[PDB]
Amino acid sequence: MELTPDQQTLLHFIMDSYNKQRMPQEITNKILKEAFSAEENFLILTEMATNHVQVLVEFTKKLPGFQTLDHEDQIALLKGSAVEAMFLRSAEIFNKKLPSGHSDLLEARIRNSGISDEYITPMFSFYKSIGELKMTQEEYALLTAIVILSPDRQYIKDREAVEKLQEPLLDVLQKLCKIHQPENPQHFACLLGRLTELRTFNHHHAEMLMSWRVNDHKFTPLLCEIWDVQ
């Protein structure tokens, strides 16, 4: 049931790459310090998402075997996973322990950010369900890698080549669930099942962004390539 020396090597390598992301405390400190207008909050999201995509591309490039894949499939994997990775990272930040009352204010600040009520409810439903799983940093890093190397993505020419890269990451995650949560044997299937709910945000992400209570929906050229906007 224990990790092999190769799997421990793979896990620490994924962890070092995952940790190069913007610190959660840095993000929560800005949202908790001052209450911003819907216009200011849209600009905050656009800058936050641009940095996330940039760091995600660097994390994706370091995933073992990713560089050996067909260049057209590489783009298909990045484009098909960018939104899901953003929501998984947002869920991780939201569930990080904060001093008494700060998490209540964080939720209230996100509710009043500018997004339509229609989209706020399923977003918090996902964050709370991810939170009830009580995932470790290693589980978040592997799940992100598993999301990126999904063979079921649109326009993928060689599905088997993507499968071969995802399988060792799924194996490491399964072993970590058994070690971290031996009390809950449903833990690994719980995480995997939460990826289908993650996929639902892809279909409605463009509608979610355009429904933001602002006059101008301005996006960066990089965000326009990753999202179905402008």
Binding site: Q54, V57, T60, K61, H71, Q74, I75, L78, K79, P221, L222, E225, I226
Partner: peptide, 10 residues
């Protein structure tokens, strides 16, 4: 079409 993504990847 996705030249910024292609650039960051390569």
């Amino acid at each position: 079409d996705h030249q910024l993504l292609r650039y960051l990847l390569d």
